[PDB]
């Protein structure tokens, strides 16, 4: 299935994934496409942050779902 | 555009947007908390004029969120009272009161009309229709307790000039095939997305491809994209730089009337997407209720009125069938809470929408960023305390004739009193700090007999701060941030008099005597208001150590985030990593720049060397007997010496020759323009430079000398001080410029004597004045030098030159910042703060927030639970647990204690960077160590203030294997 990742800058990334893929594996696919090391990725979906060792289906991530790649900002 | 006021905001919006905003007249209807908050952010940002309309009399309950109202204003008109206080925010912005809006045709004078919660739905429809049909931008917003909405209608044809505000992508090209497949140089990522547009420069063999023509991008992996056929353009030879171009987008908005029946939503929270359509009917039902009950909203906590609102929503879903869609029921419980809270006026919610709506105003003026299209609904129902702890009914939520009545309306009297009795520490008194303190003033947080606020900041108020730190005025420049902010919020809410301790101390390892065990232990929680990652890490480690909740937040232009850290529940701030700042290769800096960032960093280092380090090294050489390879050469140059300003000019002219002519010739001697590796040496990132021939009519050449001379004159105490070209010519024209002679024995890296010095005896009393880099003083020549110096090197390497504003951004390391995002994220922090007050232990109630107002995007996620671990089947919290050890224990006893109590063999013991014990140590080292108390053991390897010592350990479990274990705290 196809899912989408939107960055905080507005960029959309398209990923081919299976329901049973781990979050670690989705992050590896993001690293290939974007260069961001998995440890620096914060993915959020439907009020949850996606953690390693769980699967997409654990978070009810469906086909055509959008995940948000988000950031922490330093200014204040 | 006044750079000295608008500096930080200019980096968010750009000159063109701010020029357009400065032609825009804005009208705001309604000046309760929501209207004043929007007005504050808009006035600070700088529009042509601000007009406010609110002829309603001030009542006590208005002060819940209206921070410009005082108890003495009661009876007077909201508009009139607020106008004078708004005017103070930005002297460049005229603030007027509209006395009546009898004629809807008066609206013709304005570019943007904002209707707040004082305007009926009926009137909003009429006003919107006038605006839409006349080409006037219309925005509305209303907040009702923990709920809120906004509607944007920018008319039939609105042009977005820049959808995101992100820096355009650029990159180096190594190939363009005839089908238009563009390959990136080496491992450079293009970062482009399908449907982006690029233009080209320096693509040899395809000539007209470089004329500014735009090409649509089809992405084929991270190192390639296609632009379609290029056969007709020629054949690709070498080189090339793509630059992303943002194309204009025409967008169409529907009128409020059409959008009431068929709304288009942006979601605030995807976990709650279903609620948006429910609240859309809810908010409409509230207006219908007010129509039926002589202008009155539902009674607070009233079950009878709630049932009427539910019936109103049920009836409206029939009239508006496309809102909920087929088979979807009225969410009765949600509508019930809306009715229950309708009269509420909550600071956090007011701040969230105040920030967001103000940004939408700025978009409507400028065509900068993507407008909200067209409705957004928000709730923060998780902020509600457990009804078991603080019951909500008509008795507990009743007015007690108090400024807090419309907060009591939501939370009840007892919860309100608990807010008052909180003891809090705020680290930082800048943008976030000011917004925080205002919010806390409005809450009456720390005003109760058991409560207080401690705010600390070491910094003073500067002009550029005033654009986003709204508690400060031009009169306050030079005074301390914390002290001024404390006084300003006491004037806003007298309940805080004698309750804020404004300190000027910098939180860090060096002020632990002030911020000691006693100080932290007393606190209920800590709030960050910082601008530095290390500062945040430091505070986070203290909150972990003392087991205190931390409220974290941050901004960068239109981007923002909030994080909650809860003892024994969540991970902390330091538990996760953010992208590090990217490091430029040393060889790229030294010899091979290809971006303005490279020439700026080189110029800044040169600035440092010439005017700071040089002066310091001389001063140390002349006063320090101990003093005695690059350093030595600088001292001799500094001391073999100007007697007047003319000598400083000569020196800078000669530096020009050295840096931008001689050194370049030397590099080209080593690597001629034609040199080859197969391929040419000067390709991709390596751009074949050309030596500069000094031309005083070139602005960069001229200002290098002016600023270099003026700075050298400062070093040597020579009187300095627009510069005249002919005056400088009358020095330079008479100079003999030494010819270049190549050093044959100089190696240049491709990829990443002593008694000549004069006797300090002969130069007694002589001292150099070192320059302290000051980016925000445009008269000191600092940015002038760095800009000119960078630009001359940019000229060497055919890099496009930058102006002073861009150079200052990069060399000054300035964080883009604007009041809109600041007030919004602070609002979100205060909605989490309610959960801390109720001591919520359910992780699913808390929300970390993530925003980008440019898009606009709002997203929330539940915090990550603290990772748990085990040793010898004993479970522990990897963030929150530690081994507490009483007394200055002897090493052997410590080792004994861990074997006996924990079943752990200590394999390694450390204090900071010092290793204290290891299981591989030999008997001789062990004998001098094992019988010492920890302080003495630390003394052997290397203070009275110190009450605790933190130790790190590696350990093996009972079954012999290594095991992750928490730190040790020795209590002395
Ligand atoms: N976002 S803003 O508008 O620029 O306002 C930000 C505030 C934050 C203040 N800084 C501040 C206040 C109180 N204590 C500290 C400590 C530090 C700090 C910074 C860097 C390193 C260290 S040492 C370490 F990391 F803690 F170990 C401490 N900054 N603080 C600013 O003054 C501004 O007003």
mmCIF file of C-alpha atoms in Angstrom, chain A residues 7-13 31-36 39-42 44-51 68 70-76, chain B residues 164 189 191-193 222 270-271 431-432 530-532 536 554-555 560-561 563 573 576-580 844 850 852 857 860-862 864:
data_model
loop_
_atom_site.group_PDB
_atom_site.id
_atom_site.type_symbol
_atom_site.label_atom_id
_atom_site.label_comp_id
_atom_site.label_asym_id
_atom_site.label_seq_id
_atom_site.Cartn_x
_atom_site.Cartn_y
_atom_site.Cartn_z
ATOM 1 C CA UNK A 7 7.303 17.249 6.658
ATOM 2 C CA UNK A 8 6.908 20.425 8.744
ATOM 3 C CA UNK A 9 8.256 22.322 5.663
ATOM 4 C CA UNK A 10 5.314 21.183 3.482
ATOM 5 C CA UNK A 11 7.156 18.455 1.502
ATOM 6 C CA UNK A 12 5.197 15.272 0.718
ATOM 7 C CA UNK A 13 7.032 11.917 0.536
ATOM 8 C CA UNK A 31 16.211 7.858 5.527
ATOM 9 C CA UNK A 32 16.741 6.625 1.928
ATOM 10 C CA UNK A 33 14.396 9.265 0.506
ATOM 11 C CA UNK A 34 15.328 12.192 2.777
ATOM 12 C CA UNK A 35 18.708 11.474 4.447
ATOM 13 C CA UNK A 36 17.343 11.938 8.003
ATOM 14 C CA UNK A 39 16.946 8.475 15.551
ATOM 15 C CA UNK A 40 16.188 12.098 14.460
ATOM 16 C CA UNK A 41 12.759 11.272 12.963
ATOM 17 C CA UNK A 42 9.573 12.077 14.873
ATOM 18 C CA UNK A 44 3.058 11.383 14.355
ATOM 19 C CA UNK A 45 -0.302 9.959 13.275
ATOM 20 C CA UNK A 46 -3.816 10.322 14.733
ATOM 21 C CA UNK A 47 -2.570 11.710 18.082
ATOM 22 C CA UNK A 48 0.275 9.227 18.553
ATOM 23 C CA UNK A 49 4.021 9.363 18.079
ATOM 24 C CA UNK A 50 5.288 6.257 16.217
ATOM 25 C CA UNK A 51 7.765 4.135 18.225
ATOM 26 C CA UNK A 68 3.652 13.888 9.842
ATOM 27 C CA UNK A 70 7.737 16.937 12.816
ATOM 28 C CA UNK A 71 10.529 18.868 14.577
ATOM 29 C CA UNK A 72 11.505 20.581 17.819
ATOM 30 C CA UNK A 73 12.467 24.238 17.469
ATOM 31 C CA UNK A 74 15.165 26.054 19.382
ATOM 32 C CA UNK A 75 14.014 29.723 19.337
ATOM 33 C CA UNK A 76 12.100 31.478 22.134
ATOM 34 C CA UNK B 164 5.878 28.019 2.546
ATOM 35 C CA UNK B 189 20.405 15.567 -2.584
ATOM 36 C CA UNK B 191 15.482 17.917 -1.946
ATOM 37 C CA UNK B 192 12.835 18.636 -4.616
ATOM 38 C CA UNK B 193 9.270 17.331 -4.829
ATOM 39 C CA UNK B 222 16.978 11.499 -4.182
ATOM 40 C CA UNK B 270 -6.180 14.609 13.308
ATOM 41 C CA UNK B 271 -7.074 12.455 16.352
ATOM 42 C CA UNK B 431 9.431 36.230 23.584
ATOM 43 C CA UNK B 432 8.006 33.039 25.155
ATOM 44 C CA UNK B 530 14.738 29.534 26.180
ATOM 45 C CA UNK B 531 16.546 30.079 22.863
ATOM 46 C CA UNK B 532 19.325 27.483 23.248
ATOM 47 C CA UNK B 536 17.024 23.330 27.608
ATOM 48 C CA UNK B 554 10.155 26.617 21.010
ATOM 49 C CA UNK B 555 9.689 28.555 17.779
ATOM 50 C CA UNK B 560 6.665 25.816 16.743
ATOM 51 C CA UNK B 561 6.436 22.974 19.238
ATOM 52 C CA UNK B 563 6.564 19.213 24.957
ATOM 53 C CA UNK B 573 13.523 16.416 26.644
ATOM 54 C CA UNK B 576 15.483 12.229 21.992
ATOM 55 C CA UNK B 577 17.743 13.947 19.436
ATOM 56 C CA UNK B 578 17.172 16.794 16.974
ATOM 57 C CA UNK B 579 19.190 17.357 13.743
ATOM 58 C CA UNK B 580 22.664 18.784 14.547
ATOM 59 C CA UNK B 844 -3.055 9.799 26.835
ATOM 60 C CA UNK B 850 3.790 20.776 16.514
ATOM 61 C CA UNK B 852 3.782 25.557 11.130
ATOM 62 C CA UNK B 857 -0.361 22.882 9.972
ATOM 63 C CA UNK B 860 -0.469 16.789 18.338
ATOM 64 C CA UNK B 861 0.915 13.589 19.775
ATOM 65 C CA UNK B 862 0.690 11.864 23.126
ATOM 66 C CA UNK B 864 6.360 8.847 24.815
#
